[PDB]
Amino acid sequence: RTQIRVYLLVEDLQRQFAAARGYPPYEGEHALIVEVSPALAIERVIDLALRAVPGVQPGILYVERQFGVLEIHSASLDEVRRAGEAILAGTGNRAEDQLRPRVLFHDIITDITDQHAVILNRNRQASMILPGQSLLVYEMTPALFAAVAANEAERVAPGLTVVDVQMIGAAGRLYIGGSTDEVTVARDHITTVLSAIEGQEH
Amino acid sequence: RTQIRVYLLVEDLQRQFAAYLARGYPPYEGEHALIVEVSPALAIERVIDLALRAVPGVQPGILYVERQFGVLEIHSASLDEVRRAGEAILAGTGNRAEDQLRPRVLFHDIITDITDQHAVILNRNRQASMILPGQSLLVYEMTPALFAAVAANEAERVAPGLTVVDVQMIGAAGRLYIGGSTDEVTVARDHITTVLSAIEGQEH
Amino acid sequence: RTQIRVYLLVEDLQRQFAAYLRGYPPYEGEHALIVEVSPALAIERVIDLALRAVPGVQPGILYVERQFGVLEIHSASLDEVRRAGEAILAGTGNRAEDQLRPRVLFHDIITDITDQHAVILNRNRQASMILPGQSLLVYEMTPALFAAVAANEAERVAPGLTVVDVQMIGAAGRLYIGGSTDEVTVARDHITTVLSAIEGQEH
Amino acid sequence: RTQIRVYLLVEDLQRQFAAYLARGYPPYEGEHALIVEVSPALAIERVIDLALRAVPGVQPGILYVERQFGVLEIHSASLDEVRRAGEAILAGTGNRAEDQLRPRVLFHDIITDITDQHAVILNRNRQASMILPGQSLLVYEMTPALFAAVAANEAERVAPGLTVVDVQMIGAAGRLYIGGSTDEVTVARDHITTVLSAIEGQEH
Amino acid sequence: RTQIRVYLLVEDLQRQFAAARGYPPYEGEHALIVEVSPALAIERVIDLALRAVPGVQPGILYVERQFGVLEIHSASLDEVRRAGEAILAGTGNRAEDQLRPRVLFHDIITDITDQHAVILNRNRQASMILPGQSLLVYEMTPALFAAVAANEAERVAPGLTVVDVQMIGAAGRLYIGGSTDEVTVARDHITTVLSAIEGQEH
Amino acid sequence: RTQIRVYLLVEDLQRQFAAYLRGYPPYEGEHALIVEVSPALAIERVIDLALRAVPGVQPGILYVERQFGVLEIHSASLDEVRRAGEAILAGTGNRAEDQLRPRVLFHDIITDITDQHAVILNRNRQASMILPGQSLLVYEMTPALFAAVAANEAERVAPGLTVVDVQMIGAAGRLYIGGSTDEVTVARDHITTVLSAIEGQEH
């Protein structure tokens, strides 16, 4: 009855990525991210986690057009694992029955024009990209996988700028600004991470 | 040409659900409604004109064109008025009531004794009444989405102490959130399942 | 890799549609290039291709939707817009007729609109408004970005009409036009002709 | 320390105004309400606790901190419950009912036979019921803003066929928009003026 | 009973400025702008104009925290004057009983930094300023006077960029981008226009 | 000409308040300069003064409100922030103590918050949430931008508390803090001390 699309431990949160919403996560804490179908089943999923481990906090809970999304976090890695396990047990699913990440698009725009940069910035928010910087774009599905890609990219290239991360919808989208080599190091690494993630076929 | 996804008379509106209702005139307790969902979405503009010009005494409460589908709610104090407006729509589009889709249940569950953290984040993604920690929560998902309308109204009739937390009747799927004692939410769920099964329509 | 769904030169913008058009605003008499692509995020490469090939053009729309990506660029010079488009075609390995052919989803003319219909209609809108008693033309098509040319062409052949609403983003495009029964009938007929004449692939 | 700007029992809610009502639980027709406006704005957080802990059976419908002032609405099916919660607020802040400001009328007028262009642009800056071309429109402005609440409810009692188009009860001034026949809107305006004059309070 | 704060014919609208809302004005048309107190009296003001001259259209109608605001427009200058006259007659006011414009602030920031430019752009909308351009800011009250200043500024320096115009509130605000001399020509001219406008004292 | 209402070095940002802070986001441990001025539009000159004097700082808040203008800038270097502030002072002909003295408008501690209060309270909010049974400290002051230092200082002396809401823009500032009755009492006392110690003019 409950199909799990994404089930992932994101360990050791980087500080930029830490920024529908509930309690906000902080740098160094750990997260469990779950995407499911049908969307409304996510309400049973969150009760399963919160009643097993009172010490974890909900950061995202949203019922989208098709899918249901959840993020929970804690300072203790042991606590998040245990919440993940209660979800798997209460729904009769396994971790490797999730969908495998499917890459939809990626590219590097070097030396973004100023007119491109200014319009980019106003239906993003949070961080911004400045004219002259290089831009990496990356699209995947299921959408919630954008989360782990963002965190890993920042990990290996800490000088980069997280411009935007869309984790909810039909597809996930990542925007990263920096020097041409920072964004190349990030792109190469993301591809590796996603290919190594185990799951079934769409 | 114009396909009817949902076509339903919702008779005798209960007071929580009436208040819960993109928006036009608000319906009131005891009044009657006609709900219609169609494809392609923009056809609903022909549907509302058909109704409003046949029976000038009905009032539009909802009119909206979504990503895929078109939605209309009309209501009146007179049950005969809503009925006749419904017939103008059917005749003017060459459709019949049983040309609609029969309800398909996607999910349902009863979460007892909701934790306080679940209740607090649940209450800020909803905007009407609120659920309190300790209450039991019923969630019910179906498609087409507009059937969520009749499910909410039937639940309140049969269990008037419940709390209508949210009713999502527009989109690819409808979602119902109901709070109360475990026996109130269990009585509502059983009735809803019966009501949706009794409805006549085509196959997805 | 980048699939082009809509690629169109829309030349000589009429003033109602021009203002209707987010980034820099176009003006009456200027020319625009409209592009809808799949997958959505590919549109960022598409706009980069245009702006550095022909710097004199300005972006008016840039948006990443649920499934698709949308771009509008414009300039006073028809040549600058055309040349920017060519850059987009070469850098994605496409040509203009590799786009999707326009598919008509629904159209209708509501004469003598009732007042209850008009007031609730005007509240899901924005800009111009329709008055009780006017006639309403509604027109739906896909891909959505084709709604742009339908709107601009309608205003060209019947400038007295009222542009109520134009939805160019999504799974489907929607056009709302108000005027006399004759203005909108002339508008509806011309829109169908324009759309049939556009060459593209299948669906 | 805590100054009361508005303190009022609104008895027996009429159905249009009840539905019209930052938001918490929705009130229903026939229920009773207590409305309070205070200064400084943040003091209202002490006021709601005072009420909710004295009489657990009342429900908050409105709680909001504005640019200058703080606002609360609580309601119940029991008139005695709203009354007693009101008294807890007065006792716990060292205030009395007549410490409030007496209503000051800023403007009123009756626009007959509204033009269609006025009606169409008027309807998109309002979000509830709508006014139709040809109807007469009453506008009424007062301060403090929260008195708009009692003015709307009194008008509907005395002229039930009217249309409540908008009620702005939060801010520096309250505004009331009412539609109907010229005699319905004239009957409402006369009554409102009497009601506001009869209210006891201090001087601006 | 009805106090008129601003009463002004803005003749021959420039194309940039032509962009709460009703029907949109077009380049070359003419407008009447009215601000009043108490705010709600603006509903009597608009009925007076629309019933006298059916051929004019409402573009702005809004009841703000303190004041009421109206804009109407037409292709015929004769029509707008006539609507203005119906308002004056129906409320027993005179055109020169409005408030005189009071200048609150103005300044020219030359060569705006790129970090300043990018953040400026996201809680504006419509047009944008690019890094390196010069910026003129101008504040006045009553707020509705920002309207005539914007239109006049564009008239004498058509190459300029109208970044934003706030006409509703306690004070009006104008943002203009261009070369340092375009913005200086605009600023000098605005000052002249406002000083020449006749009204009473606050 | 430019009147300074608030001018403050807020050094060593705590992590709840840091995230709470629109433009570039500050991080825990960095330093910020906060400025509230009158008239509102003067703030555009104020920020220009800072960013080109010390380019290494980043703007986090820039807003023109009904009456007043607000600016926040930040950097990892306390010296860069201080030096940017000095540029703001020289270019406007002010000094730090020409600002307004903080005026306390209301404060209170609600113990054992009822559940109906908590759920409706959480719906006019944003970020962190208060749970039924916790104690609530509310604190109101003017000018509003002083709410920033009150929030950051409270978190410094009682890091276990929950920052529910901080309103720094307007006619008045408002602080919402949740925790145990002891955390918030310690927080309330320290806030009053900090505010009394700030030197400025009258009101």
Judge contact between B20 and B178, C-beta under 8 A.
no
Terminal-to-terminal C-alpha distance of chain F: 19
Q: After which residues is chain A broken (C to N over 2.5 A)?
A: 19
Euclidean distance between CA atoms B64 and C124, whole angstroms: 8
DSSP string, chain F: --EEEEEEEE-S--HHHHHH---SPP-TT-EEEEEEEESGGGHHHHHHHHHHHSTT-EEEEEEE-SS-EEEEEEES-HHHHHHHHHHHHHHHT--GGGSBPPEEEEEEEE-S--HHHHHHHHTT--SS-PPTTSEEEEEEEESGGGHHHHHHHHHHH-TTSEEEEEE-SSSSEEEEEEE-HHHHHHHHHHHHHHHHT---B--
Inter-chain CB proximity A130 and E115 less than 8 Å: yes
Phi and psi dihedrals of E80, rounded to 5?
-65, -45
Judge contact between B73 and B82, C-beta under 8 A.
no
Phi and psi dihedrals of E155, rounded to 5?
-65, -40
Euclidean distance between CA atoms C172 and C138, whole angstroms: 13
Touch test D–A: 3 Cβ pairs or more under 8 Å? no
- For residue C164, the 8-state DSSP code is E
**Dihedral (Cα; E170, E176, E180, E184), 10-degree rounding:** -50
Residue C179: Cβ within 10 Å count = 22
Residues E32-66 as b/e (b if ≥16 CB within 10 A, e otherwise) read bbbbbbbbbbbbbbbbbbbbbbeebbbbbbbbbee
Interface of C with B in 136-175 (CB under 8 A): 136, 138-140, 170-172, 174
Terminal-to-terminal C-alpha distance of chain C: 19
Phi and psi dihedrals of D53, rounded to 5?
-95, -20
Token pair in block for residue B170: 């527009």
Touch test C–E: 3 Cβ pairs or more under 8 Å? yes
Euclidean distance between CA atoms C138 and C159, whole angstroms: 17
Instruction: Provide the residue count of chain C.
Output: 203
The nearest CA of chain F is from the CA of A84 a distance in Å of 23
The nearest CA of chain B is from the CA of A20 a distance in Å of 6
Inter-chain CB proximity B121 and A58 less than 8 Å: yes
Find all residues with CB under 8 Å of D13, minimum gap 6, and list them: D27, D28, D29, D30, D31, D32, D33, D75, D153
Three-point CA angle E114, E116, E121, nearest 5°: 95
Judge contact between F57 and F97, C-beta under 8 A.
no
Measured between CB atoms, does D123 come within 8 Å of chain C? yes
| Nearest CA among D88, D84, D100 for reference residue D3 | D100
Token pair in block for residue F93: 């002909």
Reduce the DSSP state of residue B57 to 3 states and report it.
coil
Euclidean distance between CA atoms B203 and A129, whole angstroms: 51
> F141 to chain D: which residues are within 8 Å by CB?
none
D1-101: CATH topology is Alpha-Beta Plaits (3.30.70)
Measured between CB atoms, does C55 come within 8 Å of chain A? yes
Q: C31-38 and C3-10: which strand pairing? A: antiparallel
Residue D86 vs residues A174, B68, B194, D14: alpha-carbon distances, Å: 54, 50, 46, 21
| Nearest CA among A21, A31, A3, A63 for reference residue A147 | A31
Phi and psi dihedrals of E88, rounded to 5?
-60, -45
Find all residues with CB under 8 Å of C120, minimum gap 6, and list them: B24, B60, B63, D130
HSE-up of residue D112 (Cα within 13 Å, Cβ side): 5
Interface of A with F in 4-23 (CB under 8 A): 15, 18-19, 21-23
Euclidean distance between CA atoms D1 and B64, whole angstroms: 50
What is the greatest pairwise CA distance in chain B? Answer: 52
In chain B, residues under CATH classification 3.30.70.1710 are 1-101, 102-204
Inter-chain CB proximity E43 and D141 less than 8 Å: no
Report CA Rg, chain F: 17
Q: Check whether the bond before E54 is cis (ω within 30° of 0).
A: no
Judge contact between F73 and F57, C-beta under 8 A.
yes
Judge contact between A165 and A140, C-beta under 8 A.
no
F1-100: CATH topology is Alpha-Beta Plaits (3.30.70)
Resolution (A): 2.7
Experimental method: X-ray
Tell which CATH architecture fits domain D102-204: 2-Layer Sandwich (3.30)
Euclidean distance between CA atoms E20 and C4, whole angstroms: 38
Euclidean distance between CA atoms C40 and C59, whole angstroms: 17
Residue E160 vs residues C27, D4, E185: alpha-carbon distances, Å: 15, 52, 10
Inter-chain CB proximity F123 and B119 less than 8 Å: no
Residue bearing tokens 């419509």: E126
Find all residues with CB under 8 Å of B77, minimum gap 6, and list them: B30, B31, B32
| Nearest CA among E153, E162, E161, E148 for reference residue E184 | E153
Token pair in block for residue E98: 């409005």
Phi and psi dihedrals of C36, rounded to 5?
-115, 130
Euclidean distance between CA atoms E69 and E71, whole angstroms: 7
Could you tell me the sign of the dihedral formed by the alpha carbons of C21, C23, C29, C31, in that order? negative
| Nearest CA among F66, D59, A65 for reference residue E64 | F66
Judge contact between D184 and D110, C-beta under 8 A.
no
Measured between CB atoms, does E201 come within 8 Å of chain A? no
Phi and psi dihedrals of F50, rounded to 5?
-75, -50
- For residue D131, the 8-state DSSP code is P
Euclidean distance between CA atoms F36 and F17, whole angstroms: 18
Burial environment of residue B9 by CB neighbours within 10 A (0 to 12, 13 to 18, 19 or more): middle
Helix E146-156 vs helix E180-195: angle between axes, to the nearest 10 degrees? 130
In chain F, residues under CATH classification 3.30.70.1710 are 1-100, 101-203
Measured between CB atoms, does E128 come within 8 Å of chain A? yes
Find all residues with CB under 8 Å of F103, minimum gap 6, and list them: F141, F142, F203
A1-99: CATH topology is Alpha-Beta Plaits (3.30.70)
Token pair in block for residue D153: 């409810």
Reduce the DSSP state of residue B124 to 3 states and report it.
coil
Judge contact between F174 and D65, C-beta under 8 A.
yes
Judge contact between B153 and B73, C-beta under 8 A.
no
Euclidean distance between CA atoms B24 and F198, whole angstroms: 53
Euclidean distance between CA atoms D102 and D5, whole angstroms: 9
Q: How far is CA F25 from the centre of its chain?
A: 15
For testing contact with chain A, the best of B104, B116, B121, B135 (most A CBs within 10 A) = B121
Euclidean distance between CA atoms E8 and E193, whole angstroms: 12
| Nearest CA among D171, D142, D147, D140 for reference residue D36 | D147
Residue F80 vs residues A129, B40, E101, E118, F89: alpha-carbon distances, Å: 22, 60, 41, 21, 14
Residues A52-89 as b/e (b if ≥16 CB within 10 A, e otherwise) read bbeebbbbbbbbbeebbbbbbbbeeeebbbbbbbbbbe
| Nearest CA among B61, B42, B63, B45 for reference residue B53 | B45
What is the greatest pairwise CA distance in chain C? Answer: 52
**Dihedral (Cα; C146, A116, C28, C148), 10-degree rounding:** 10
Residue A143 vs residues A167, B195, C41, E40: alpha-carbon distances, Å: 5, 36, 13, 49
C27: left (phi over 0), alpha (psi -120 to 50) or beta: beta
Residue A200 vs residues A36, A98, A141, C49, D75: alpha-carbon distances, Å: 14, 6, 13, 37, 54
Measured between CB atoms, does B115 come within 8 Å of chain A? yes
Residue B127: Cβ within 10 Å count = 12
Judge contact between D127 and B26, C-beta under 8 A.
no
The nearest CA of chain A is from the CA of C79 a distance in Å of 20
Interface of F with E in 169-198 (CB under 8 A): none
Q: How far is CA B97 from the centre of its chain?
A: 17
Helix A114-122 vs helix E114-122: angle between axes, to the nearest 10 degrees? 40
Token pair in block for residue D114: 């509204």
Element (H, E) at C13: none
* Domain covering C101-203 in this structure, CATH number: 3.30.70.1710
Euclidean distance between CA atoms E13 and D4, whole angstroms: 49
Inter-chain CB proximity E173 and F63 less than 8 Å: no
Three-point CA angle B129, B130, B136, nearest 5°: 120
Reduce the DSSP state of residue C46 to 3 states and report it.
helix
Token pair in block for residue E132: 């390196």
Token pair in block for residue D86: 């009101």
Amino acid at A160: L
Euclidean distance between CA atoms A158 and A111, whole angstroms: 20
Residue D6 vs residues A6, D65, D199: alpha-carbon distances, Å: 53, 15, 11
**Dihedral (Cα; B8, B9, B13, B16), 10-degree rounding:** 0
Burial environment of residue C129 by CB neighbours within 10 A (0 to 12, 13 to 18, 19 or more): buried
* Domain covering E100-202 in this structure, CATH number: 3.30.70.1710
DSSP string, B61-114: EEEEE-SS-EEEEEEES-HHHHHHHHHHHHHHHT--GGGSBPPEEEEEEEE-S-
Residue C52: Cβ within 10 Å count = 17
